[PDB]
């Protein structure tokens, strides 16, 4: 995941406006969306 923007777009596809949120969940995961929704779900880390 480079810049995580394709990943942003992965959520921007679903209608997620929380880019500020997502980018951080992305940084936390390393560049995964499916894992990001879990980081987001927990709100910090598993």
UniProtKB/Swiss-Prot annotation:
PTM characteristics: Deubiquitinated by OTUD4 which stabilizes UBL7 expression.
Segments forming domain UBA: 2-43
Tissue: Ubiquitous. Highly expressed in heart, skeletal muscle, testis, thyroid and adrenal gland.
Protein induction: By type I interferon. Down-regulated by phorbol myristate acetate (PMA) in bone marrow stroma cells.
Function field: Interferon-stimulated protein that positively regulates RNA virus-triggered innate immune signaling. Mechanistically, promotes 'Lys-27'-linked polyubiquitination of MAVS through TRIM21 leading to enhanced the IFN signaling pathway.
Subunit composition and interactions: Binds ubiquitin. Interacts with MAVS; this interaction enhances TRIM21-dependent 'Lys-27'-linked polyubiquitination of MAVS.
Protein name stated in the entry: Ubiquitin-like protein 7
Origin species: Homo sapiens
Lineage: Eukaryota, Metazoa, Chordata, Craniata, Vertebrata
Span within the parent record: 336 to 380 of 380
